[PDB]
Amino acid sequence: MSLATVGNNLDSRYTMASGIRRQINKVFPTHWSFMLGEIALYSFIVLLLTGVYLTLFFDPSITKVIYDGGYLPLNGVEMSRAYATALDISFEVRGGLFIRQMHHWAALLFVVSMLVHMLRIFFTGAFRRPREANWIIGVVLIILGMAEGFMGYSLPDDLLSGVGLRIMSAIIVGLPIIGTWMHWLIFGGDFPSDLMLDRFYIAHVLIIPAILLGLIAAHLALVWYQKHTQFPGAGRTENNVIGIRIMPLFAVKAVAFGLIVFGFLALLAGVTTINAIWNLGPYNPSQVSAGSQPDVYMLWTDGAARVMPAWELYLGNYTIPAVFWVAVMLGILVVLLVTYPFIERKFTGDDAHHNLLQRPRDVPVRTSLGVMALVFYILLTVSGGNDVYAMQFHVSLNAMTWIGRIGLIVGPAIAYFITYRLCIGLQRSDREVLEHGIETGIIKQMPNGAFIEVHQPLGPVDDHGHPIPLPYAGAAVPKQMNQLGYAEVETRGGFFGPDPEDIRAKAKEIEHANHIEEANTLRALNEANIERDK
Amino acid sequence: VGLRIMSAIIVGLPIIGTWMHWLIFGGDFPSDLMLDRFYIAHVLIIPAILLGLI
Amino acid sequence: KQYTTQELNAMSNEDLARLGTELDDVTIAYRKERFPIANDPAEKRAARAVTFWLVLGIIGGLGFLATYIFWPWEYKAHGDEGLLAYTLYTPMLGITSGLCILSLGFAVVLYVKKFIPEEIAVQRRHDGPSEEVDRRTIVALLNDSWQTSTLGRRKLIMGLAGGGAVLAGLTIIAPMGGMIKNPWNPKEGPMDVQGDGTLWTSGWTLVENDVKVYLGRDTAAIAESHTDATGEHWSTTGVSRLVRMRPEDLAAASMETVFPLPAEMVNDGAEYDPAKDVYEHQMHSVHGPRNAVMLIRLRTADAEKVIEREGQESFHYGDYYAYSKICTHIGCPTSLYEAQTNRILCPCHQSQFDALHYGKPVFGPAARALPQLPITVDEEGYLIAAGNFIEPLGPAFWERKS
Amino acid sequence: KQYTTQELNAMSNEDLARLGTELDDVTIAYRKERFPIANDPAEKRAARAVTFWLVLGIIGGLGFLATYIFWPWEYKAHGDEGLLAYTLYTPMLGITSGLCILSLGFAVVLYVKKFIPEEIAVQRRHDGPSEEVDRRTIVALLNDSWQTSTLGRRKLIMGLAGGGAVLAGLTIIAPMGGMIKNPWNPKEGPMDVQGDGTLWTSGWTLVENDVKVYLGRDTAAIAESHTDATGEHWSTTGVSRLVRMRPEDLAAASMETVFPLPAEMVNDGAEYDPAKDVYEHQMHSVHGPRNAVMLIRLRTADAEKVIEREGQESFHYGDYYAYSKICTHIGCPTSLYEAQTNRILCPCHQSQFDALHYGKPVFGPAARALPQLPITVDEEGYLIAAGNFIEPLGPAFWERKS
Ligand code: HEM
Ligand code: HEM
Ligand code: FES
Ligand code: FES
């Protein structure tokens, strides 16, 4: 076939035969955690493309028009050109509503996917040496992704977006030397300003996407260069990777998971409404709603402003407003996240070149601090959303603010305590299995009447008839007998009937032969590791 | 006037000229969505492609 | 090592695959076919399972194209027939779009699961500190370039060139000073119904012994359409959004947001000219950032227990008080006037201002009382601003005294 | 090969540089210091030559910062004092900015020229067809993956999956059909002074037995400012850009561009109301793409030798002819009426239309005559369009007959 001619013509010119061989043969581990990041990547792809489709219709201008579009309930209402063009996307373009909702849902999925991916990186310990650079890059990404998404939903100039813009401007003006100067620099004047929405539009469609794309490219390139970490397991060492090659069996799975995420987004974009701007009306600074919170990924920085106890300083001709302290708090919160691996180094007392991951149970301090930060962030989030929470679940609004205040101290401590003790209990169960074997659950009575539970050893048994303890290795310990194969089906066939018996027996024989062959190869690989380590 | 020339050349193509013009400009020339499509084409699309190809 | 072509011509394809994997330090320590048996029914079952999702994806995508093209999609009001189709257009097309892509993904996942072999590929790492040769000669080359170039002996050239470098950076950065603006300039106009830009001013500043400014209520009037042989066009020539108000229009325990309405831009009442277009300026006054004020009429029983602020003694006009609607924390409109508790509430971060204790905060992030507007009735019986705010309204900034 | 650390610890730095270069197949076949002599004056000369441009760049960059910050930069009219500074602001700052960066570049060029050694580095290439092993095992791996995966035996799965792939592409592409619009819809309005969107219509289409449409001349009126205690704002309530015209306003051999002016949007003459804002619609009629027409008054001597087009016999009104101003080639305004040669000329690509031979082209890319507008005086003595264009004006499109 002419495919060989194409390949020949390519390689005779570019000599890629050595390199692409090395690329296709790279090995990637197959844990389920290790494609959370791919979700964020796929969401970013969708964010790009749907965004580019929205720009052929959106007009980022704060100057007014008397609306005369397809949405009849606002004919004659004087509105910003931004809001009018967003409405024309929603109503006058075939399927523009579908697209706009997909863009928004993709933004939410993108941010939460980054959050969960970062949680995996934090708990499993993958940020450690040499990979802390990917942490410093990645934290910047999850900051900018929020910064972008915020100004992304600020653009339509509806009533719910402009209040968040008002909040941002009023926070900037309050800074204790340069606030007025920084505000006049950013907005080009007092708020609302003529040049405001175009600066934010270009910041949203060109600048921050360009930076995110560059940083994501560098991130993935670094992950590819220094190969992926892995969990401890049979035959795994600090100096090797066990998994599947990037093709055929991994690239197709990446394509398939891309398809799944893509289609999931296209479903939820048509089936759930998001940001129904047409019933919010255009922005004017005199109007506000009871539930006027920012997007979900910004609710934490709303909740901070809700829980600060109004401490304000007056110094003669000057004043530090009460909102400077939430800026300090949120900055400290961001600094701690940004610089984490080094404050981990200074107290952990090690600088080793780790390539194997820690199970979160085996590192109770870090996982306890992670759950502590999770409850802190969640209390900030729900305090941001407490207006809705109190309205729906009928808890007094003052009680919600005080729950946020006192909880941001107390609840983290309770989280740390419970998380630490639970982790210790988990690893105690692991040791109990490794030194006594699995508890099958089969209870038998001896002739003496003693009730005994037969335990099924994993390692060899002493001549007294009891297991010899194994050393814990960091790999997961099986805790039941269905996880050793002992509940697998003996019958073969589909629904409504069996396979013929000859096929049945031969298939089961081949299955068991493979099951012992893979055990043998992993066992020999582990023994080779022992020999090669001395 | 150059924009007028471009639109009038597009409309003259011997099957799809009117359709291609209405696609590109969103209607008859001058159109409300014209300058924003060209703005985003100028600041984002073609710079992105030129940067990638370079 | 260094394989000749003869041996490669004598080498089998699976052996060549082994050689290719081994050349990159990857060993396929396990690889087994999914269906070894020839007449195995399980292969038929797997093929059926994959093809089911494939045909589901085919019909899903065809259904998408049909729904996108043919399904009614234009807006329908509440009372219109065919509202059902319009309110299912986006949901139906998205449902089937997602079904198409999701089922194609499911089909590919099942194909890789049931058909492609299992694999355990092991690859060695080459990371950590570099080999001692490369990392010692790379410092040799760099030092050699730095010293065969004689910069390190020449201090004056280096200093002047560093000066030129910082100068180049600074001049590349000074056009970035086009954005820098002085916040305290009056933006080159006498004064507007939105002030002069600076944070010290608002619309009500026009009452600084210059202009008569009524308290204008918002009528929320839209533009009005007019159509004839020339075509449909919208007109604001006969309407006015802001309107004056007499003191008998509020009842006790009532609220209304009022805006500054200079006497020049009033087109209501006995003066109503049907052909005077004042709508643009009135709307331009509504959209001022810092000029919406809550006018509150209290009960007599509650007006007894008011505490006046030092210097704001005579601002009220009987039952009527007039506070600024802009919150003193971050500047959201406060706007939640509890009629019995008499607490003005801000929905953004739950500040509570006691309307009876001169608008002093009682809960939430706010630290400072709402400024108060003096008001009085005019010669004709409408309500007017009897003065300017004595205190800078809005959020606090660094140079704001107190 | 495979150097131990002991030898590298015994190896000299220049030898290490040689080893590093050789490890990448690059040989420095020539490298000589620029100034071997110790007390050489040439080194002093080179240092002076570099430092001269460096100080020039320093003063250039300082001059840029001074000019950017302190030089007057705001607009000055023709009669204003200080016009010189404003008209030198950008030139002065750019002059010194370019001097700064250019002199820094010159300094670096001279430094590399006179100080850094000369070099002749030779490097071998590794390109062209790949080595026979790599390129034979890379086809082994690919074929092995393709055949251990069993796609090539399964035709039905491949066909259905290719169907699903094209279906996924098509549904990812159908929202791109939001842009597609039918060019021949009337854009949902009765009719405007700009037509109904379609290329078959213009403003003058309103004369299709519906509306009285005058030939309106452009007065080029700006909006008028008005300032008082409320502030300066611009008004168009008392002005009108389009104005009617009597037949005695042109002289012989004269031209004027006229636009469609429906009777409803006229605010001139005896009907002039100082408080009727018609400016927006009139300007909305001026900016119609295809409704500017050249009204030409000829000499009597030249009106004798006119050739009328079949069907356009009675369109003129005496000396007055009225052609469409939009060129029939690509649609630039023609607008260059030669008063003696009587050739209407288009500046874009030099089409020439004979105004006497019913506007037929005589030179340039144009192939088709300018359409003609029938005109007649009304009851009051102004000029009105007595009908609609019988021929589609503007550039030709595919479905335009002739
Ligand atoms: C849009 C943002 C991001 C994208 C697209 C992305 C993508 C990826 C992908 C695909 C991987 C490999 C597969 C996997 O680990 O699941 C990965 C690994 C990694 N990510 Fe991210 N990520 C993002 C954000 C972050 C964040 C927020 C952090 C941490 C603060 C981070 C730190 C890391 C590190 C350290 C690794 C390598 C860990 C290892 O090798 O085991 N990344 N990233
Ligand atoms: C090529 C990059 C992008 C482009 C061109 C783009 C374009 C746009 C445009 C024009 C709008 C406003 C128009 C509308 O409301 O439909 C918008 C809104 C929005 N953008 Fe983007 N965007 C891009 C990337 C992103 C990213 C990376 C995120 C998230 C981190 C994001 C999140 C949002 C959100 C949440 C909205 C509001 C949607 C709505 O209110 O309907 N966008 N985008
Ligand atoms: S804006 Fe009012 S409490 Fe914050
Ligand atoms: S536009 Fe008139 S000659 Fe081309």
**C333: CA distance to ligand 3 center in Å?**
8
Return all residues near A158 (Cβ < 8 A) that are at least 6 apart.
Answer: A83, A86, A277, A280, A281, A282, A283
Residues 6+ apart with CB under 8 A from C391: C371
Nearest to D179 among B17, B23, B28 (CB): B23
Strand (E) positions, A2-42?
27-28
Residues sharing a CB contact under 8 Å with residue D41, sequence separation 6 or more, in sequence order: none
**What is the rounded CA–CA span in Å between residue A55 and residue A278?**
19
Which residue out of D348, D360, D363 has the highest number of ligand 4 atoms within 8 Å of its CB and is therefore the one to mutate? D348
Contact pairs from chain B to chain D, CB under 8 Å: 54
What is the phi-psi region of residue D243: left when phi exceeds 0, alpha when psi lies from -120 to 50, beta otherwise?
A: beta
- Could you give the residue ranges of the DSSP H alpha helices within C24-154? 41-70, 83-114, 132-148
Q: Do A249 and C112 touch (CB under 8 A)?
A: yes
Residue C397 has which token pair?
Answer: 């900034």
Nearest CA in chain C to A396: C350
Interface touch B36/A59, C-beta < 8 Å: yes
Give the minimum alpha-carbon distance from A107 to chain D in angstroms, rounded to a whole number.
19
Please give the structure tokens belonging to residue A410: 């107390």
Measured CA to CA in angstroms, residue B39 lies from A60, A282, C330 at distances of 11, 25, 35
B42 is in an annotated binding site: yes
User: Which three-class secondary structure state does DSSP give residue D293?
Assistant: strand
Q: Which residues pair with A452 in a beta bridge?
A: A444
Q: Cβ of B27 and D197 within 8 Å?
A: yes
Helix (H), strand (E) at residue A11: helix A3-14
H or E, element range at A455: strand A451-456
CB-CB under 8 Å, D8 with C144: no
- Using only C-alpha atoms, chain D has a radius of gyration, in whole angstroms, of 39
Maximum Cα interatomic distance, chain B, rounded to a whole number of Å = 35
As a whole number of angstroms, the distance between CA C375 and CA C293 comes to 11
Q: At what angle do helices A324-338 and A340-348 cross, to 10 degrees?
A: 60
D327 and B8 Cβ atoms separated by less than 8 Å: no
Residues 12-51 of B with CB under 8 A from D: 12-15, 17-19, 21-23, 26-30
Complete DSSP assignment for D49-101 = HHHHHHHHHHHHHHHHHHHHHHS--S---TT-TTHHHHHHHHHHHHHHHHHHH
Output the CA–CA distances (angstroms, integers) from residue C207 to A360, C268, C335, in the order listed.
Answer: 67, 21, 24
Of D60, D132, D276, Cβ closest to residue C5: D132
Q: CB C101 to CB D264 under 8 A? A: no
DSSP H helices in A132-158: 132-154
Cα of C241 to ligand 3 centre, how many Å?
Answer: 28
Q: Which two tokens stand for residue A477?
A: 């310990």
- Identify all chain A residues contacting C187, using CB atoms and an 8 Å cutoff: 189
| Alpha carbons D51 and A482: distance in angstroms, whole number | 82
Known binding positions of A for heme: 103, 117, 204, 219
Cα–Cα distance, B18 to D183 (Å, whole number): 6
Cis peptide before A130 (omega within 30 of 0): yes
Chains sharing 3 or more CB pairs under 8 A with chain B: A, D
CB A145 within 8 A of CB A212: yes
Which CB contacts under 8 angstroms, 24+ apart, belong to C205-212? C205/C388, C205/C389, C206/C260, C206/C262, C206/D229, C206/D230, C207/C260, C207/C385, C207/C386, C207/C387, C207/C388, C208/C388, C210/D229, C211/C262, C211/C263, C211/C264, C211/D229, C211/D230, C212/C262, C212/C263, C212/C378, C212/C384
Question: Which residues are near ligand 3 (CB < 6 Å)?
Answer: C 327, 329-332, 346, 348-349, 351, 364-366
Locate the ligand 3 atom nearest the alpha carbon of residue C349 and give its number.
3
Nearest to A77 by CA among D280, D235, C282, C236: C236
Which residue do the tokens 């996982």 mark? A367
Q: What is the CA angle A106-A109-A114, rounded to 5?
A: 125
**C378 phi, psi to nearest 5 deg:** -90, -170
Q: Angle of helix A132-154 relative to helix A159-172, nearest 10 degrees?
A: 120
Q: How far is CA A125 from CA A227, A375, A418, D310, in A?
A: 15, 20, 21, 90
Report the C-alpha gap between D202 and D192 in whole angstroms. Answer: 8
Q: How far is CA D166 from CA A319, C315, D170, in A?
A: 64, 74, 6
Name residue D348's amino acid. Answer: C
**DSSP label at C208?**
T
Given a contact cutoff of 8 angstroms between Cβ atoms, the answer to whether A182 and A246 are in contact is: no
Eight-state DSSP code of residue C372: B
Distance C73 CA to ligand 2 centre (A): 24
Q: Give D-chain residues touching C107 at CB under 8 angstroms.
A: 161, 164
D294, D323 Cβ separation under 8 angstroms: yes
Q: What is the Cβ-side half-sphere exposure of residue D152, based on CA atoms within 13 angstroms? A: 7
Q: Which among D204, D245, D211, D218 has a CA at the least distance from the CA of D382?
A: D245
Cβ contact C–B (≥3 pairs, < 8 Å): no
C-alpha to C-alpha distance for D287 and D241, rounded to whole angstroms? 12
A8 touches chain C (CB under 8 A): no
d(CA A154, CA A277): 11
Q: Do A55 and B44 touch (CB under 8 A)?
A: yes
A contacts of C335 (beta carbons < 8 Å): 287-288
| Cβ-based contacts of A245 with chain C (< 8 Å) | 26, 119, 121
What ligand has the least distance to the C-alpha of A295? 2
Which of C73, C87, C97, C176 is the best mutation test for A, with the most CBs of A within 10 A?
C97
Residue of A47, A50, A54, A57 to mutate when probing chain B, most B C-beta within 10 A: A57
Q: Resolution, rounded to a tenth of an Å?
A: 3.1
Tokens standing for D304? 């004798």
Question: What residues of chain B, 1 to 54, have a C-beta less than 8 Å from chain A?
Answer: 26, 32-33, 36-37, 40, 43-45
Q: Would you report the helix, strand and coil content of chain C in percent, each value rounded to 5?
A: 35, 20, 45
Helix, strand or coil, per DSSP, at residue C327: coil
Q: Cα A445 to chain center, whole Å?
A: 51
**Which of A46, A54, A108, A110 is the best mutation target for the ligand 2 pocket, counting ligand atoms within 8 Å of the beta carbon and taking the most?**
A54
Q: Which residue of C has its CA nearest to D49?
A: C157
Spatial distance between the Cα atoms of C295 and C261, rounded to a whole number of angstroms = 14
Domains of chain A with bracketed CATH: 2-424 (1.20.810.10)
Residue D45: which residues within 8 A CB-CB, separation 6 or more? none
Q: In sequence order, what are the residues at sequence separation of 6 or more whose Cβ sits closer than 8 angstroms to the Cβ of residue C213? A: C203, C204, C206, C207, C260, C261, C262, C263, C384, C385
Structure tokens at A125: 């310990």
Measured between beta carbons, which residues in chain B are less than 8 angstroms from residue A57?
33, 36
Chain A CB contacts of D134 below 8 Å: 17-18, 21
Is there a contact between D328 and D389 (Cβ–Cβ < 8 Å)? Answer: no
Burial code (b: 16+ CB inside 10 Å, e: under 16) for D5-31 equals eeebeebeeeebbbbbbeeeeeeeeee
∠ Cα A237 A243 A244 (to 5°)? 150
Tokens 């620099």, located at residue: A185
How many residues are given for chain B?
54
Judged by its nearest atom, the ligand closest to the C-alpha of residue A221 is 1
Of A36, A121, A144, the one to substitute when testing ligand 1's pocket (max ligand atoms within 8 A of C-beta) is A121
Closest CA to D281 of D245, D224, D242: D242
Instruction: Report the nearest atom of ligand 4 relative to the CA of B5.
Output: 1
3-state secondary structure of A212: helix
